[PDB]
Design a protein around this ligand. Structure first.
Ligand SMILES: [Cl-]
Ligand SMILES: [Cl-]
Ligand SMILES: [Zn+2]
Length: 905
C-alpha cells in the first residue's frame, strides 16, 4: 500500500512553508552538503521567458542585497570555497539547485553560507550592468560546448521528446531571449517561483539532528511566508507511430543501430509500483546479461557490443532502448544482430535460470550496499534524496531496499516478464535510429523499408531458443574446527548412536542391499504443542511454507535446480510433540543431503506468496465451515473431549495477524536447540567419510535462543459428555464414542502389540455384529490411540447408520465390546496376528525410507530408537493369557467417555 521512509532521515516544514531534509553521514568525515532546491525549472517558462530559469540561476552569483556584484564569490573564496569544486548550481526542466559542500569544523563559516542561502531565496538584485555581462557569459558557454555528443542529442530530441513540454523547453532557451531579457522580466520570474513553499533545504553529512535543524531555523525561518505560483503539469501524449532517423557526424566514434520505445514512467511509492518499475528494470538487465554472455562465448563476432538502457524523458515518461554497436562500418550485421536478438526474445522469452541469475546478482549488490552504507558517496546520496524530494517518492534505506527486493521480486516471473515484453513490443510509440560517422557506413545504413523488411524476416523465422549457462550452485557450509563426536554407543546389531559436542544425537543404520539411496531424518522433540492457543494451528502451516521456500542464498527455483543436479529430495512434518525433517540423497554423492539438512535448519527463508495462500485458504475454510457438517461436528467433538483453549478454531484476525516473519520465527524455534535433535541416518556410506560429514554439517549447528518448553499435551475434559447435533441435511446418522483410559505404567512395545491384537479381534466382532447384521450400520470403525506423554489410551468407536437405529446400534456395539473384553483373544486370532506382523517385520528392513521411519517411530512412541529390533522375539513370546492380562489391566474401566451423535435437521 505504501513504502517506509528511512529512519535516519528527518523531514519537516517551517511555518513559512520551506521544506527540509536532514540525513546524517560520515564517509567524508566532518563534511556537509547544503543544497537549496527550487521545485521549478525550464518547463515553467512562458513563451517569452525561454531560458529565463537558467538566466536566474546564473544571476544568483551576480548580486544580492548584502553581496552586490561578485562579492558572494569573493566571500565563498575567503572560506576556501570555489565555484566549480565546492559551490555549484544547475537548472534542469524540473528544478533549480544551489549546492555547497564544506567542512563541519568551522562553525561561523556554516553560518555565513546559511546567510548566503537566505539571500539567494529573496535578496537577488538583478542589476542592469550585471545582467548585460551574463548575456555574454551564457551565450559563449552555449556556443563553446556544441560538440559531437551535443549535436547527437540535438538530432535525437524531436524523436525522443515528441509531445512533451520538455521538447519546447530546453533549459538554455533561445539566444534571442538571452540577449533581450530585461532585468524586470528576470525579477518577475524570480518573485513568482522563489518562494519558501516552492523550496526544499537539504542537509546531508557529519552533523547531528539538533545542530542541522538550528542551522535551518536560525536563518531560513525569517523568510516571509509568501506563496509561489502553482507549478504546471504537461502530461505526455503518446506518439503512436514509428519514426526513423540516421545521425551523420564524423566526430562520433561509434557506428550502430538502436530501437527506442517511449512509455509512461511510474513513481515508486507503493508495493505495486515498486514491482512495475522492477519488471522494466529486469527486462533491461536480462537483455544485457544475455548479450554479454553471447559476446563472451564468441556467438556475436559480427558486432562490437550493445546495451539496453532506460532514460527519463519527461516527469511522467521514459524511453527503453536496445542498441547494437557495429563492427567498424558493418551496419547490416549490426541490424541483423539487434533484430535477431529481439525476435528470439519474442519467440522464447527469458529462462528461469536467466531470471534467477539477474535476481541473485542484484540482491548480492544490495547485501553489500547494506554493510558498506556508512561508506556511501556523499554526492550520490545527496542527489538521491533531492530526487525523492522532487518526485515526492519515499527515500528507502539500503536495508529496506534489500528487504523489499527479496519479498516483492518473488512476484516477478518468466510469465509476468513475458507479458511486459509482449506489451512493449506492441507499443507504437517507437523509433529506429542509426549512427554513421563516414560515407561508407552511411551508404550501408538501412532505409525505413529495409528495416521493416528485416523485421518481418526474423518475425517469420522459427528461431532457435537460447540456452543460458546458469551459475554454479552450492550449499557449501564452512566447517566448525571445534566440532567433535563426544560419545559412542551400540544400540542393536545394526544401530549406532553418536552424541556431538553441540549436544545433538545421531542414529546410524546400514540397509542390506545396494539401493544406493541415503536417508537423513532430523527429529526434533518440539512440536505444535509447544506454542500458545493463537499459534498451535499455524505451526504446520508455517513449516510447509518455510519448506516450500529457498534456503541459504538460493531461491525456491535455484533450490529446485540444485536438488535435481545433486539428486536430492526434502520433506517435513509437524506433529504435536515432534517435527521431522526428511532429506534423501545418493550414497555416491551424500554431501548435498547433509548440506540441505544444515541449510534448512540454519538458513531457512519464507516465500510470502506461499504464506498468503495458506492464510487465505485457512480464512476461506473457516468462512465456509457450515458447508462441511462432518468436519464442523468432528471439531465440536475435539473441543468436547478436551478442556483446552488450543482446540479452538482461529478467527480471521488471528490468521491475518500471523505474518510471514512471525511464521519464519516460529518454524526456526523447532530445530533451534541442537540438544533437542536426533538425526536418523540410514544407508550404505563409508563411516569415515560419513563421520566427516556429521561433524561438518550436524556438529556445526549452534544453539539459538528460544522460549519453547517441552510440549504440554492437551488438557483432557474431566467430565463425560453425550452430545447430539441436528445439523445434517443428509439422512445419515454419524455416531462417535471415545473411551479414555489412564496408563498407570507407560505402554511399552509388548503391551502395544497385545492391545493392537485385541483391537483387531474387537474390530472383527463389530463388523460382523453391527454392519453385517440386517438393517445395521453402513460403516463401522474401531481405532485405538496411545498418548505416552499424557499417559493415557483412547478408544474410538465410530459408525454411520440410519437415524432411527442410532440408539439401538450404540447399545449393541457396547455390549459386543463387553463380551469381547470378557472372552479375550483366541489361539487362532493370536496366531493370525503373529503371522501378519511377522510378514511386515521382514519387509521393514527392505527400503532405506521404511527403516528410517521405523527407528523414528520407535523414538517417538517408546523413547528408545532400538525398541523395534526386539519385536520378532516379543512376537513369538505373546500368549493368550499375556494379552488377556494386558487388556484387563489397560482397557477394563474408562476414566471418561465422550459421545457424539450427528443427526439430520
Ligand atoms: Cl538559440
Ligand atoms: Cl520512482
Ligand atoms: Zn549555466
Amino acid at each position: 500500500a505504501a513504502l517506509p521512509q528511512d529512519e535516519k532521515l528527518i523531514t519537516g516544514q517551517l511555518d513559512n512553508g520551506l521544506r527540509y531534509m536532514i540525513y546524517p553521514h560520515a564517509h567524508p568525515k566532518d563534511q556537509v552538503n547544503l543544497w537549496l532546491q527550487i521545485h521549478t525549472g525550464s518547463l515553467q517558462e512562458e513563451d517569452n521567458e525561454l531560458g529565463v530559469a537558467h538566466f536566474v540561476e546564473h544571476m544568483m552569483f551576480n548580486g544580492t542585497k548584502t553581496w552586490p556584484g561578485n562579492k558572494v564569490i569573493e566571500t565563498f573564496e575567503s572560506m576556501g570555497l570555489r565555484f566549480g569544486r565546492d559551490v555549484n548550481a544547475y537548472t534542469s526542466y524540473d528544478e533549480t539547485v544551489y549546492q555547497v559542500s564544506l567542512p563541519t569544523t568551522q562553525k561561523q563559516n556554516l553560518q555565513q553560507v546559511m546567510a548566503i542561502f537566505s539571500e539567494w531565496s529573496n535578496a537577488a538584485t538583478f542589476e542592469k550592468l550585471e545582467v548585460d555581462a551574463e548575456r555574454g557569459v551564457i551565450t559563449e558557454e552555449w556556443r563553446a560546448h556544441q560538440d559531437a555528443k551535443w549535436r547527437t542529442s540535438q538530432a535525437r530530441r524531436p524523436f525522443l521528446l515528441a509531445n512533451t513540454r520538455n521538447l519546447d523547453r530546453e533549459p538554455i532557451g533561445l539566444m534571442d531571449t538571452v540577449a533581450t531579457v530585461t532585468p524586470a522580466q528576470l525579477r518577475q520570474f524570480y518573485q513568482r517561483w522563489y518562494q519558501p513553499n516552492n523550496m526544499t533545504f537539504i542537509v546531508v553529512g557529519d552533523i547531528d539532528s539538533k545542530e542541522a535543524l538550528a542551522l535551518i531555523k536560525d536563518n531560513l525561518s525569517k523568510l516571509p511566508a509568501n506563496k509561489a505560483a502553482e507549478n504546471r503539469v504537461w502530461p505526455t501524449k503518446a506518439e503512436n507511430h514509428l519514426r526513423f532517423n540516421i545521425i551523420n557526424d564524423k566526430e562520433n566514434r561509434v557506428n550502430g543501430i538502436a530501437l527506442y520505445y517511449r512509455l509512461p514512467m511510474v513513481q515508486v511509492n507503493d508495493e505495486q509500483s515498486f514491482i512495475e518499475q522492477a519488471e522494466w528494470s529486469m527486462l533491461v538487465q536480462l537483455f544485457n546479461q544475455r548479450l554479454q554472455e553471447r559476446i563472451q562465448s564468441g556467438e556475436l563476432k559480427t558486432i562490437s557490443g550493445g546495451t539496453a538502457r532506460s532514460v527519463k524523458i519527461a516527469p511522467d515518461y521514459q524511453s527503453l532502448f536496445f542498441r547494437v554497436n557495429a563492427r567498424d562500418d558493418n551496419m547490416q550485421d549490426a541490424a541483423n544482430a539487434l533484430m535477431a536478438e529481439l525476435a528470439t526474445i519474442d519467440q522464447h522469452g527469458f529462462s528461469a535460470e536467466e531470471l534467477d541469475d539477474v535476481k541473485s546478482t542484484r540482491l548480492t549488490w544490495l547485501k553489500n550496499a547494506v554493510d558498506q552504507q556508512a561508506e556511501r558517496d556523499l554526492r550520490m546520496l545527496t542527489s538521491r534524496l533531492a530526487s525523492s524530494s522532487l518526485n515526492n517518492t519515499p527515500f528507502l534505506s539500503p536495508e529496506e531496499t534489500y528487504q523489499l527486493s527479496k519479498r516483492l521480486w518473488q512476484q516477478i516471473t518468466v510469465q509476468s516478464l513475458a507479458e511486459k515484453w509482449q506489451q512493449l513490443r506492441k507499443n507504437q510509440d517507437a523509433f529506429w535510429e542509426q549512427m554513421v560517422n563516414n560515407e561508407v557506413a552511411a551508404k550501408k545504413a538501412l532505409s525505413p523499408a529495409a528495416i521493416l523488411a528485416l523485421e518481418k524476416e526474423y518475425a517469420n523465422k522459427k528461431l532457435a531458443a537460447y540456452v543460458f549457462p546458469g551459475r554454479n550452485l552450492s550449499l557449501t557450509v564452512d566447517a566448525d574446527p571445534q566440532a567433535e563426536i563426544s560419545s559412542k554407543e551400540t544400540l542393536a546389531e545394526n544401530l549406532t548412536s553418536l552424541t556431538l559436542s553441540n549436544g545433538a544425537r545421531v542414529i546410524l543404520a546400514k540397509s542390506a542391499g545396494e539401493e544406493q539411496k541415503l536417508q537423513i531424518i532430523a527429529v526434533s522433540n518440539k512440536g505444535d504443542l509447544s506454542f500458545p492457543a493463537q499459534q498451535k494451528s499455524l505451526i504446520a502451516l508455517a513449516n510447509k511454507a518455510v519448506s516450500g521456500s529457498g534456503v541459504g542464498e538460493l531461491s525456491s527455483s535455484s533450490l529446485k535446480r540444485w536438488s535435481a543436479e545433486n539428486s536430492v529430495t526434502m520433506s517435513s512434518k509437524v506433529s504435536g510433540m515432534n517435527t521431522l525433517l526428511s532429506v534423501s540423497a545418493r550414497t555416491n554423492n551424500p554431501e548435498p543431503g547433509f548440506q540441505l539438512i544444515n541449510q534448512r535448519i540454519t538458513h531457512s527463508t519464507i516465500n510470502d506468496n506461499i504464506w498468503a495462500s495458506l492464510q487465505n485458504a485457512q480464512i476461506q475454510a473457516l468462512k465456509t465451515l457450515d458447508q462441511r457438517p462432518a468436519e464442523k461436528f468432528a471439531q465440536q467433538m475435539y473441543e468436547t473431549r478436551y478442556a483446552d483453549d488450543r482446540t479452538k478454531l482461529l478467527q480471521e484476525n488471528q490468521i491475518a495477524q500471523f505474518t510471514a516473519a512471525d511464521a519464519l520465527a516460529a518454524d526456526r524455534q523447532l530445530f533451534s536447540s541442537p540438544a533437542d535433535i536426533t538425526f536418523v541416518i540410514v544407508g550404505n556410506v563409508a563411516e569415515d567419510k560419513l563421520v566427516a560429514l556429521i561433524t561438518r554439517y550436524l556438529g556445526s549447528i549452534k544453539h539459538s535462543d528460544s522460549p519453547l518448553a517441552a510440549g504440554k499435551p492437551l488438557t483432557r475434559a474431566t467430565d463425560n459428555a453425550s452430545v447430539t447435533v441436528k445439523e445434517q441435511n443428509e439422512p445419515v446418522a454419524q455416531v462417535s464414542q471415545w473411551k479414555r483410559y489412564d496408563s498407570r505404567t507407560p505402554v511399552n512395545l509388548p503391551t502395544r502389540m497385545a492391545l493392537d491384537a485385541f483391537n483387531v479381534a474387537l474390530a472383527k466382532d463389530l463388523r460382523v455384529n453391527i454392519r453385517e447384521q440386517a438393517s445395521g450400520a453402513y460403516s463401522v470403525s474401531s481405532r485405538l490411540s496411545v498418548d505416552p506423554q499424557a499417559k493415557d489410551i483412547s478408544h474410538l468407536l465410530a459408525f454411520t447408520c440410519q437415524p432411527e437405529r442410532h440408539d439401538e446400534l450404540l447399545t449393541l456395539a457396547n455390549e459386543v465390546m463387553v463380551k469381547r473384553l470378557a472372552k479375550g483373544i483366541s489361539e487362532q486370532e493370536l496366531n493370525e496376528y503373529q503371522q501378519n506382523v511377522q510378514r511386515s517385520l521382514d519387509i521393514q528392513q527392505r527400503s532405506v525410507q521404511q527403516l528410517a521411519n521405523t527407528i523414528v517411530n520407535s523414538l517417538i512412541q517408546y523413547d528408545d530408537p532400538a525398541a523395534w529390533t526386539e519385536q520378532e522375539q516379543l512376537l513369538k513370546q505373546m500368549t493368550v493369557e499375556n494379552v488377556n492380562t494386558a487388556v484387563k489391566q489397560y482397557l477394563s474401566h474408562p476414566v471418561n467417555t465422550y459421545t457424539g451423535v450427528l443427526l439430520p435437521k
